[PDB]
């Protein structure tokens, strides 16, 4: 009841005594203590229906106005809310238990919201205003903030926040959700630990990224990484990561940095796992060379259905590269670099499965000989509209990289998994 | 633990006495005197546990605050620090002889790191900002620096400085290091002493310049040599040498001396060999003229992965020159000029080898013909983790440049080396 | 922007929409391919068709009659990619019978009589399947 008018009076009185114009003076603690005392004194000096509880509340609200986020502080705190969505200064929604709901926490007006947004984003050296009404940011708490201003958004400043995620889609989620076998899971774990290159290919909707992220989660932390993504989608877990991104054409048809330049520049910064987001232009070439010159453990993605189609696509990309190499040298390079070409595909039942786990055995004539470590053999389709199969093995005694797995000190696990898969 | 707090206090005292807002006053020497004087006065009046050495360190820290590099200096001053990696404002890693770790040295604000990067690239007339967000450079002291800007790097600026090191390899030592087999060593000695227009290609981190120095160590003394470099790296061991270097554009971007102009002028100094430090632009054109109009022995290095890409890149550069030459003319010119291409590269396991020793044979329509004498054919990898190969020989009975070998009477030794290698 | 929109049709935002300028659903799909190629991402010409076959699930065509009136004409779907061409299974259509004594065009809204449309499986989730079956049956009668 008496919160609004009393808070307005406190704001006016404190501004008269010690306003924000004293910035750089009455440091955060100093201003907090002084404002608390001034509000306590004004509650009696001026008629204030705010009792002791309302007195502490007014002190807290003054702290918020001068310093804090105000109405978002509660929701930003609560642990049952993962995502917060503010549509104009009036309506705020929250994702509780995997579903959106409305809770009335209004802002004083649009100016307040458009100031809170800047105070939020600038915490990591950004700023959003009427000369750049878009903003996105990532924070130390694993969160991600996205802000749009009133020049575009009609309703009013629109904010979206996704707070900490901790249970990233680790392998066990893939396993138990009927998309990969256990022994295959251990084989993948070893393929990732042994810094053996890999390339991921999946039909439309196969979800290349999710898989690539699950794989990156394997790298040993001591290995410096450089992820040259197209849009900031990968969410790595290591301490040593280094992000990047491209830039599209400007209004004058210039000022663009295509991913080729980024992949070229990543060579300098002494990396040890040049991860990529997607391979469409000639960048393939550069990436492959990076795989060969002593960066054992890179990754990547591309669009193709069956692994052999993936190899053909890579060769087509390089040919589009405009370098004119013979059709044999390119194949030799691919056979020398790539070590596993995982697969991912979406089946008619709407699920998502890892159909193949293919290697690159070698070069023979004009055919790059490959062998498979696992495959997805369907058995039938159920009444509920599903497609069900099984992950079949091939009892292979030794892959091409067995020596490497012997080196990095995880030799047994590979054979244990491959042999026990027959169980 | 008094270092940080005392330093903050002394910085505040200096700012109150002489603040950075007084720019254009208290200049280089005036500052070097007044800052030290105020520091001594504060240390005398203001009890600081810092000693005379610590007092000098604090004085230098304030000097850095004024016009310095930021906290990089205490790192750079060391010798065990072989690499400095920034990755944003909040982290600085280092490698110390085989191991790598994090350090408890940090920056204050992305403004500090960004300004330090802009300054250190202004040392060699380079500027990195929101218009050209990428900058690679080599500082005069010898070490290499790379920097990426906020628009791409999502974590603010990212900067890497690689410690300088010296190789000075020799052809008699390369054989022990297993780079080139002794038969190859004799063949290359003949190829270098016989004034053969060659081009030493190389891939990322391959280490061309060492090879180029090792090769030029074969030149006969009296020959008047002329280089054209950008960093003053080489170390020629001949009495009659003339050295050179380009002068990048001034702060206003005017009066620049591009390697092209250096070459076009070296054409008039009566040189016998025009060595070049590297090939980046249309200067190749001029160099090719030097390769053709009676300056036999000109060398040079360009960044290419395999010879049949190096040729295409040379053609692309010449076309980019904007001369309007039809492509076929460019191919004719290259076929006429170049004589040998030595493609060196770094294999996966980190070693350095010489993979190709090729000779341009001629032109047949729209395809250039090459007759690789050697190829470092990969055989396998040992159990200890290092690859294994062998320098196979195609064993051409008489290479193209045989005539030259005759004119200098060295042909017999080349024939012996071929016979040994042919088997 | 069509490409980006297709991403939304793909990465679990099922329910996107859009509007574009065309006359014949095949012409509409050709226009979409042209738009995606405009971006210059370098995609081949078959992957674009794969993307458009895996993304879209209805292509409604509405038109203006020659006479000066508007009618809804096609409720075509997308069935798949057979080789290098896209296929359709137009559910409903509107056929121009002729003219009246005044001159206005006349016609009938007809259902080709397909039994289980492609999106039927999806409609199974939301318990609409019975309603769709009933409507198609009444049309077929």
Residue numbers in the entry:
A (entry chain A), B (entry chain F): 80 to 502
C (entry chain B): 362 to 502
What do the authors of the reporting publication say about this deposited model?
The bacterial tight adherence pilus system (TadPS) assembles surface pili essential for adhesion and colonisation in many human pathogens. Pilus dynamics are powered by the ATPase CpaF (TadA), which drives extension and retraction cycles in Caulobacter crescentus through an unknown mechanism. We show that CpaF assembles into a hexamer with C2 symmetry in different nucleotide states. Nucleotide cycling occurs through an intra-subunit clamp-like mechanism that promotes sequential conformational changes between subunits.
To understand how the absence of nucleotide might regulate CpaF assembly and conformation, the structure of CpaF was determined by cryo-EM without nucleotide addition but in the presence of Mg2+. In this case, CpaF was less stable yielding a map resolved to 4.0 Å resolution overall. Henceforth, this CpaF structure obtained in the absence of nucleotide is termed CpaFAPO. CpaFAPO formed a C2 symmetric hexamer with subunits arranged in an open, closed and open’ conformation like CpaFAMPPNP and CpaFADP. Superposition of the three distinct NTD2/CTDn+1 units within the CpaFAPO hexamer showed close alignment with RMSD Cα ≤ 0.7 Å. The overall effect is a relaxed and more rounded C2 symmetric hexamer.
